């Protein structure tokens, strides 16, 4: 889910733009 | 009337060079963005 997180396009950003959720959230 | 170089108007102004009845537009930046066609298409 692109829930308003991440990049529009991970194209010219120097990353793969991969997103994850902060596992230590609580 | 000591005229700090920041102001220093040479160059008589427009109204004074042309006169009181001729209008004077100055159009730098334009209206009407590029994507709005001049001639429109029909539908």
């Amino acid at each position: 889910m692109y829930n308003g997180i991440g990049l529009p396009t991970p194209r010219g950003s120097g990353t793969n733009g991969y997103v994850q959720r902060n596992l230590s959230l609580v | 009337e000591v005229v700090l170089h920041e102001d220093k108007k040479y160059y008589p102004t427009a109204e004074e060079v042309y006169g009181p009845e001729v209008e004077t537009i100055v159009q730098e930046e334009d209206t009407q963005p590029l994507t709005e066609p001049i001639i429109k298409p029909v539908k």
Binding site: - | V2, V3, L4, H5, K8
Partner: protein, 500 residues
């Protein structure tokens, strides 16, 4: 039939400019029946362009008018093209579109020429429209500096004595500072090889040197010429001045000497702040921690208002005035040193082939120019604070204060201006107003600059980096206090000296 691409754009512009000329007059407003010397009117045209570019008044003595008007018209066409191209590329470079490496250099050279044309004009306008500072403002500034120094009980700085004890320490520091330039010992050049030679021989025989120095300082008032060039920081340029090594050594020494003596005699009060006691991250800490320790600073119960205003002095190094500055230096140093400094700012400044003479501002690439800028900024701290509050901040001359301290709480709370720091020419002031001080300030503001149409809210600029939960909130009373405070501070500074 090949296109015009990117490498033939300048070449093609000139093919067609000089074709157009040859069509234009040298064959359609002749009557030079013989053989119309078009090959020579084109030579004028190219020298008219070189002279425009070098800022030389080009006039060929006898040359018919139609030809002179044709040439002037076409040089102005080429100059409009050249300048608009410089604008265009500078925007591209500033935001980041080219990496091309000949455009970066062509454009640094184009804007250096344009800056020097603007500058030679500004010096001519000085000598024509006369000292911009009146004979009433100059006298108020002079008299106010005298009252400062006399209430401080300053003790003017004397000529570096003959058997002074510290001079080899001061000269050793000078030369260490100068070698730091050539730390790497690269391919440097002839001129840097020669400067390194001078440093080493004056490192070996430290008294031939000091003899030479004090001789210069005593007799010389006409110096060589300095060269200029720019350092391109991709978002703006920085001037970089190149002075001759002999005088570089005499100034390095004078720099060290003036700063040592000024700090021993306590010339600069504690709010003048690139100071040696802390780094900038520590000043930010001390400012936050000075605000927070003001007395009842966070209370709004009775309707107070704190205002933190911060700005810049907007051209000080460039409307310093060498005659007023000579006299204001004489209040402080030995008339010999005052004259050396002031005559050393007035040199010939030279880039590839353009030359002009500095007469108005200050060369910031001299080595005592730190001293001159901070002393002038002291005078303008005095015009902003007034002598009474500036003397409360600096505390009694027998018992100075530290950076943002006062003596008691009465004196600290006796005025709206609670803190003041002036980095080299950046100004950060902190006011604390009561309800009626604020109301009267805003009254006298509106009386003069009336805002009936609630348009004060529009100009206000905040920080679009915090969330709106954390930015500034523009209510009527707030933005009107902000503007009144600024309007009141910008009125203390004559416009011929500096502005805001």
């Amino acid at each position: 039939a090949k296109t015009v691409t990117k490498q033939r754009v300048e070449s093609h512009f000139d093919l067609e400019l000089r074709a157009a000329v040859m069509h234009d007059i040298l064959d359609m407003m002749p009557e030079g029946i013989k053989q119309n010397k078009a090959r020579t009117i084109l030579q004028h045209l190219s020298e008219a362009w070189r002279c425009w570019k070098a800022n030389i008044p080009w006039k060929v003595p006898g040359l018919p008018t139609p030809i002179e008007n044709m040439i002037l018209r076409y040089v102005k066409a080429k100059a409009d093209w050249w300048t608009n191209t410089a604008h265009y590329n500078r925007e591209r470079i500033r935001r980041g579109a080219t990496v091309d490496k000949t455009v970066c250099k062509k454009n640094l050279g184009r804007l250096t020429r344009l800056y020097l044309k603007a500058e030679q004009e500004r010096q001519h306008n000085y000598l024509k429209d006369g000292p911009y500072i009146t004979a009433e403002e100059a006298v108020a500034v002079y008299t106010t500096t005298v009252h400062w120094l006399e209430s401080r009980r300053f003790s003017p700085i004397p000529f570096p004595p003959l058997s002074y004890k510290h001079d080899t320490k001061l000269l050793i520091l000078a030369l260490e500072r100068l070698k730091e330039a050539y730390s790497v010992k690269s391919r440097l050049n002839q001129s840097q090889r020669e400067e390194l030679g001078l440093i080493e021989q004056a490192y070996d025989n430290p008294h031939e040197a000091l003899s030479r120095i004090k001789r210069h300082l005593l007799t010389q008032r006409a110096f060589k010429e300095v060269g200029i060039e720019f350092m391109d920081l991709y978002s703006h340029l920085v001037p970089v001045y190149d002075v001759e090594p002999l005088e570089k050594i005499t100034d390095a020494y004078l720099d060290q000497y003036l700063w040592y003596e000024a700090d021993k005699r306590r010339l600069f009060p504690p709010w003048i702040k690139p100071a040696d006691t802390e780094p900038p991250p520590l000043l930010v800490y001390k400012w936050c921690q000075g605000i927070n320790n003001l007395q009842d600073v966070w209370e709004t119960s009775e309707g107070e208002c704190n205002v933190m205003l911060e700005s810049r002095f907007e051209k000080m190094y460039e409307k310093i005035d060498l005659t007023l500055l000579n006299r204001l230096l004489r209040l402080i140093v030995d008339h010999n040193i005052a004259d050396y400094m002031t005559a050393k700012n007035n040199v010939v400044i030279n880039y590839k082939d353009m030359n002009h003479t500095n007469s108005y501002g200050i060369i910031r690439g001299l080595q005592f120019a730190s001293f001159i800028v901070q002393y002038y900024g002291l005078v303008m701290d005095l015009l902003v604070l007034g002598l009474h509050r500036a003397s409360e901040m600096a505390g009694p001359p027998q018992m100075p204060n530290d950076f943002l301290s006062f003596q008691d709480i009465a004196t600290e709370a006796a005025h709206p201006i609670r803190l003041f720091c002036r980095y080299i020419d950046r100004i950060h002031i902190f006011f604390r107003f009561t309800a009626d001080e604020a109301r009267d300030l805003i009254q006298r503001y509106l009386t003069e600059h009336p805002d009936p149409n609630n348009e004060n809210i529009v100009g206000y600029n905040n920080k679009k980096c915090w969330p709106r939960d954390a930015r500034m909130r523009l209510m009527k009373h707030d933005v009107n206090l902000g503007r009144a405070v600024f309007w009141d501070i910008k009125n203390r500074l004559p416009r011929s000296v500096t502005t805001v």
